[PDB]
Design a protein around this ligand. Sequence first.
Ligand SMILES: Nc1nc2c(ncn2COCCNC(=O)CCCCNC(=O)c2cc3cc(Br)ccc3c(Br)c2O)c(=O)[nH]1
Ligand SMILES: Nc1nc2c(ncn2COCCNC(=O)CCCCNC(=O)c2cc3cc(Br)ccc3c(Br)c2O)c(=O)[nH]1
Ligand SMILES: Nc1nc2c(ncn2COCCNC(=O)CCCCNC(=O)c2cc3cc(Br)ccc3c(Br)c2O)c(=O)[nH]1
Ligand SMILES: Nc1nc2c(ncn2COCCNC(=O)CCCCNC(=O)c2cc3cc(Br)ccc3c(Br)c2O)c(=O)[nH]1
Ligand SMILES: [Fe+3]
Ligand SMILES: [Fe+3]
Ligand SMILES: [Fe+3]
Ligand SMILES: [Fe+3]
Lengths: 453, 430, 452, 435
Amino acid sequence: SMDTMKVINDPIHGHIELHPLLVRIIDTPQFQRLRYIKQLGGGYYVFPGASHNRFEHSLGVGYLAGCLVHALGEKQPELQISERDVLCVQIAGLCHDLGHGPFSHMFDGRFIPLARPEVKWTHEQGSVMMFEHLINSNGIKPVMEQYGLIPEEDICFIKEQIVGPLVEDSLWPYKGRPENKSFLYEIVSNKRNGIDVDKWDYFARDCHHLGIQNNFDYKRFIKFARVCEVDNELRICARDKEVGNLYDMFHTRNSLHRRAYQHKVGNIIDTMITDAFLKADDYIEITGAGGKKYRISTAIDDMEAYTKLTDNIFLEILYSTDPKLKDAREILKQIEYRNLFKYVGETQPTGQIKIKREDYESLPKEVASAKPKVLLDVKLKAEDFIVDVINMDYIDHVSFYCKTAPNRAIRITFAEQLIRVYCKKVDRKSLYAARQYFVQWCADRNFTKPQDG
Amino acid sequence: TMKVINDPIHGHIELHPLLVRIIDTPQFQRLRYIKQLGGGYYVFPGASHNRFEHSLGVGYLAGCLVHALGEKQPELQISERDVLCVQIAGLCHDLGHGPFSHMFDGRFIPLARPEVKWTHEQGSVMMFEHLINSNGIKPVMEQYGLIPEEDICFIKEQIVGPLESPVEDSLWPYKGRPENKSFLYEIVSNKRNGIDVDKWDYFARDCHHLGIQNNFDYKRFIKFARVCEVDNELRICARDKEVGNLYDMFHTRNSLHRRAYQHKVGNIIDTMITDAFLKADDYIEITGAGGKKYRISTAIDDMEAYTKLTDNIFLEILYSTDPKLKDAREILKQIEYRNLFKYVGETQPTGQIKIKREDYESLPKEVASAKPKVLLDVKLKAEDFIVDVINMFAEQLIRVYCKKVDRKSLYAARQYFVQWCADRNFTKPQ
Amino acid sequence: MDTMKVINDPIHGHIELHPLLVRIIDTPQFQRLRYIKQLGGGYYVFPGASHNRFEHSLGVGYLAGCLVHALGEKQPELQISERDVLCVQIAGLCHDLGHGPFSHMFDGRFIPLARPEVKWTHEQGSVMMFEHLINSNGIKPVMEQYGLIPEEDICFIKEQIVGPLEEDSLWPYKGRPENKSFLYEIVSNKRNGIDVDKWDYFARDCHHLGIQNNFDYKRFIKFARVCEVDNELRICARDKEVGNLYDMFHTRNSLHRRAYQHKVGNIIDTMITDAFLKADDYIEITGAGGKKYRISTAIDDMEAYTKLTDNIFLEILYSTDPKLKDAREILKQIEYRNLFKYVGETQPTGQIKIKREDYESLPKEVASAKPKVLLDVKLKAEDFIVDVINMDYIDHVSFYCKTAPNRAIRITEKFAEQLIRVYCKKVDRKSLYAARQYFVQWCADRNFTKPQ
Amino acid sequence: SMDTMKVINDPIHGHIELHPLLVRIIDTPQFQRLRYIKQLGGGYYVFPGASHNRFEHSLGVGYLAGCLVHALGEKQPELQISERDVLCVQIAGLCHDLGHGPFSHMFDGRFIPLARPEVKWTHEQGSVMMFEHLINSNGIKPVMEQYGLIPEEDICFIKEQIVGPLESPVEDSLWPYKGRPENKSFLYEIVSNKRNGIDVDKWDYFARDCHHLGIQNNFDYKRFIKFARVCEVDNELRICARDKEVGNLYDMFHTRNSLHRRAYQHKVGNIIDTMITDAFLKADDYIEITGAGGKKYRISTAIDDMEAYTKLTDNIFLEILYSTDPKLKDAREILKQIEYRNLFKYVGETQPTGQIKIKREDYESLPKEVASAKPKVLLDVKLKAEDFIVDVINMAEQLIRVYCKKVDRKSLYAARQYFVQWCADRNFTKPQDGD
Ligand SMILES: Nc1nc2c(ncn2COCCNC(=O)CCCCNC(=O)c2cc3cc(Br)ccc3c(Br)c2O)c(=O)[nH]1
Ligand SMILES: Nc1nc2c(ncn2COCCNC(=O)CCCCNC(=O)c2cc3cc(Br)ccc3c(Br)c2O)c(=O)[nH]1
Ligand SMILES: Nc1nc2c(ncn2COCCNC(=O)CCCCNC(=O)c2cc3cc(Br)ccc3c(Br)c2O)c(=O)[nH]1
Ligand SMILES: Nc1nc2c(ncn2COCCNC(=O)CCCCNC(=O)c2cc3cc(Br)ccc3c(Br)c2O)c(=O)[nH]1
Ligand SMILES: [Fe+3]
Ligand SMILES: [Fe+3]
Ligand SMILES: [Fe+3]
Ligand SMILES: [Fe+3]
């Protein structure tokens, strides 16, 4: 007794039972912070239903993580899955997104690169740092001990699930659990086949809020799921008949990626918000540890300050009166009036090296420096250009099993990067010149000839 | 020109460009920062949705219904001008909502300024006028066939009703349209029978976000809806068998009202947010016309300040550093750790007694002033009490929470409460 | 009686029925289907397989309506009328009106063994039984009450059930013109295995057998359209919908592999047929003008065939006539679970497939096979059953990409097409061994696959 | 000699393992008989998916009886549940419905009371009779001994589970049963239970009738099994569960309700049942069923000889419908009416106020007294008893519906007049229909 599981009523998963340890981790300012970070960032300004935040999705990931590890233990007891392992996997699923910043992938994937090109920051490292901070700012280690967890090993295990291994030895890299349980590291985030409960939840939830049909049935997948040995390595395998379900999922994956995550106006609005943040970064102060004041771009260095870095920043800019924020405020005002940056074109580095984040800040200048062979009336500044780099995760690298051979696999034996360009000046002459500069840049970088007309 | 918005309930929503000019304004975009169900989100993780989505949906349904009635019955002389006016009324019916929606006008303003008569509908008319004038949309109305005089009046009357100044007589009160088009006033806001497209949309959307089943089919009602004469009066009526659909609606409505809108913990959290606001109202500054500083409780007096009053205030309190807001900040912190006010009991006023908003502030003190008819010991302060008034079309509930959580403090609270119910001749709590 | 009646089915919820369909259903000719088990003798293997042809027929008519109406609303260009909808619904209702006792057992084994000279199919029986239903009741005037033109519309319904009633490369059908060709693909379709008949009985046999079925027929109907292929209007699907189709074909395999081809199930079917054959001379079914028929000849008179039903089984089982003791005894073996014994399975792979007209000769050929080593026991034809199990069989289906809505996408399983099983009526070890020797030698003489 | 476990695939319970002894009992004519008796009687003619028969249900009850008795024996070794006891309970479960006649409850609940009012016949009595006939017509007693049972006391135990205390002594509270002592009293509660209404029979037919009717079922029977106990109350061992599982209990009672209103008390359904009974009655004089020693019996007396009763099943229905004998045309026409959907017409419903229950011995008299009721408002058509059907629907609680075989408007108005007055003469609830 002492404590009790609690029921949360979610529109995707229904009744969610939660072990009291998970509840103690949820009822913390560090976790509740996720109620104020919209899942799809600026997608909301394009899809009215995309009001949802990382908090809901995180609960869903935790629930799905628990369901799947429990099913594998029930079906295959030989794996030695313990209730402790279950709890650790649920905690990892709950906290995999603790580190996101205002407007989710906008922050670590565009803003920090443009604000601090020398820094290498990702939301996953942020999640591990935030998790540590949540453990220590509240009293979570003794509760872990109260429910059987070994904080040293299990904290390591949870963090390793979130960010990966600490290494070319080809020996077992992880230390939080041994290699005999390697498959548990494939539950919350899987890079091999991209089948994890994180994508299950955000595929379902983003379809629910976007009005997209989703025919993937994750409960049916969990039911017919099983661990099997493929290439002397224990992996999560799927029943041979379940391929149809997997088709339905990958089609959902494409429909979400093409219709939403790569929405032209959605991404333009993301970069407009990034422009405001940059034009506000020097004047916005966030109080962190020891009273020290951090900026939007440096909050990630102090978890106490980052705990208060949220979509709120947007309205903190929009509602301000300080003349120093006038620049930033005005950009957000254009978003409200729907006077957006205008789309110039799209290209891909097909065949070429991929653009790195450290070079994002240099791209506008390159574009403005491109010399069209037809000399132009209007001349444009690097400040007049936005260069948007869109990366994508990524038929079947999924391990299967035969209905009678559940121990071994069957043995069966789009793009990685887009580059769009937007212009801040909107007169037809300026936009014509933008296109000229842009085509010439794609030729200079040996990128694919844009074909927008 | 024609913009398409993809909504999860209605699918593709086309918007006449005039409606779009009205949407792309700070006064309307403001609704993106006011959660539909207020504090319900803190109980239902799926209730992340805001008045903005709902408003677009209401506008779409208003248009669908008036256009369908115009096609079936051309003799009504419904014009595209009328359609646009009804759509604008649907779009803007909730412009006047405040932080956390019904929390603001139904508890906060009453407790902060008991003398004031403020409702979100009046607020909607004020915001609507302010939206009209701060952007240049009157000439756009003229550009798309509307007559701003008559039509502005018609829209505001759809939102708030007639300018209450009659001779309380049985004559025709509205001024924006004639009585021969009386049915147009029944689309966005009703109250005669409590069927309007506002309810259609927020029933469907709140069910979609709460995980509740909804088999009311608003599209089929529109199909079988027509105008007919009831007591020499034009009203929107439905074919007889559509009764089956409407039953499905009231069961949906009841299912929403008990399961979500009257949730024990949700409403406790609602009063905790209200308590934070009250304890912050003196120190939070909101700038309005001419730089003048308003408080949370006085933004409703200046629409330029009110345009910036939203759920943001919650985080402005939570993230603050002013020691004077520590009181308020701490309450919001208490919500995060889930250390909520405690539920003491529930009662109702008998007969047709209804507690008015102007009296809400006195209720805690009455409880603290009640002497348990059986003399005891522990004595509690009125500040230690919260009294929540929950409304339902005609009926009214009264719950009581205690801010102190000591096993003894709550035992004593339950007594102040039973005695209070006795003193005011209310129903004996269970 | 004019009103839309509502029926509750476990597969499909509320089934609304146009009064014309109800007048067709409330006839003895249609109610006959309540007394013919869907999976025949499979009930004696699957205790949940109590269902009959009646529930299934209601379902097929319902799905016909669902689909044809969806297409007509999504593509008004097709000129689909409510008359068209009804014709397709009636065809769906009556597509199985011709089945006999124990469904495919009767036309697929019994009639070929009892009357090899005859060519009888349950579809021919459906068209016959339908004509009889129309005329024995007042159906034609009711059709006129609801817009049908009985002349050509009856032709259209029959053509949906049996195929081109009766040769060049032109449009063989006469009930509808070629611009309506897609209507002939709803109830029965051959090119691919996508029709509402198979939809309903896939879902219903799974429901009664305990098999999981993941095919969502409502999804398919919602995303179906009419597209051009080669130069033929035909039913097409979304590219997106391929995942659903996988599940459907998987259901097909699971039904065929563990129900329709169940070993003991088919054994019991042949036992029932053996009884019927041993009873055909002595069982009387009264038909038109009071003439008397037998099980094997009731198909020649729809008035008698109306009364030819699974009931035959119990009329035999409960009989006292000594002339029928032979037949009765076989059925009692079924009740005692003393069944014919399985000997082996083979396939005519690479050979011409066995035709029905030859079924009667198969026992005897097996008994005439000369094993290399001679056995103690000698076995007679009557001691052998030769079960020929035919089936209709990756993507022979047409799709449309979202933006190419009237053009196929251009695509420029592990199941035989005939099985041959042999059982022995003698059940002692020595005779069963003998049977195996006879069976393999027959397989060698016929150059059939070498048995297990 | 030594055999094997036999696996059957059921849609409700899945893979069902059956001890070879149970299979020896199942592979008999007396048991296979149940494949030809529909579970819901005439409800199939209203619910097209209700094609299921007593056979699959019987298998299900035998299976669940085994599951539960085994769970109790495993968690509570103190109760001394033996594998012999398990088998006895499984056989009771299998054979609890061996006695049903054509169309299940239609036969013993209406047909027999109308055709032989003096006789007291219930399907449970029939089950015990058919079970004895099954044992002796086949070689079951030696097989029973082959697998450990003591036929003498164990056959008694199985019968006692099916019908109850096989006798009626003058001993108050003392143990009436003789197949097992009082320290195993709870075994008599698994298959059949009347003290609170929870037994594996109702588990199976609740879930199966929901499956085939399209009704939703919220009861999880194996969570009950997992959380079931035997405990002492009033110095009496009883099957009890865990308080947290109460949520499951309520879920089942809603199913009990949802099934009883929507299916077991369907208006058109019960009407069709009375029409079938009317056919049987108008045919009872002319249909022959051969029984023991070659004697010939009728539908109404086949219950007097288990050998003929083995051959009395829903087939009767079609034997009438397919007949040519003119003596049977009267019955045949009624069944043909069913096929054309020209059914008896509903007049009204009432209940016997207070704790009154019409007894079966009186069913035959009910149409007749109805016809003599003097409707105060003198009317046109005079209706006779034969024109009236009085359906007694039991489930305490009893409904009395009345139907008229004449269908013209005038006769139906007259019929309602007779019916309202009858309710008054009997002091029954005022027919609150007012159609
Ligand atoms: N207005 C409004 N729409 C809203 C809202 N919320 C969801 N949506 C629905 O839209 C989502 C995106 N598509 C739009 O059409 C809206 C953005 C328009 C931005 N401004 C322009 O000038 C413009 C730019 C384009 C760029 C491209 Br590449 C292609 C067509 C374009 C067209 Br068309 C334009 O008009 C809301 O709050 N307001
Ligand atoms: N800790 C935390 N919880 C959070 C947060 N956000 C949402 N929730 C969920 O809790 C709010 C209450 N849940 C509901 O109302 C569900 C709606 C349906 C009706 N259910 C109940 O009436 C109800 C049932 C219970 C059963 C058990 Br067993 C234990 C406690 C129960 C409570 Br409490 C109940 O209210 C968050 O941030 N933190
Ligand atoms: N008993 C029953 N089973 C039923 C019912 N309804 C569905 N099922 C289940 O259907 C599956 C078929 N069951 C059979 O018993 C088929 C018996 C005919 C022979 N074929 C065999 O495969 C078989 C061969 C054996 C050879 C030897 Br040496 C020893 C034991 C054997 C056993 Br055991 C066998 O099964 C129902 O009413 N009664
Ligand atoms: N012509 C002809 N008709 C035939 C034949 N065989 C069958 N039928 C069909 O008619 C049978 C008589 N039906 C009626 O009189 C009307 C039934 C009234 C409903 N009763 C229910 O219990 C019931 C209630 C529900 C409530 C809700 Br909320 C949701 C779902 C429900 C469902 Br689903 C229900 O089932 C045949 O051979 N011929
Ligand atoms: Fe995630
Ligand atoms: Fe509203
Ligand atoms: Fe069929
Ligand atoms: Fe039973």
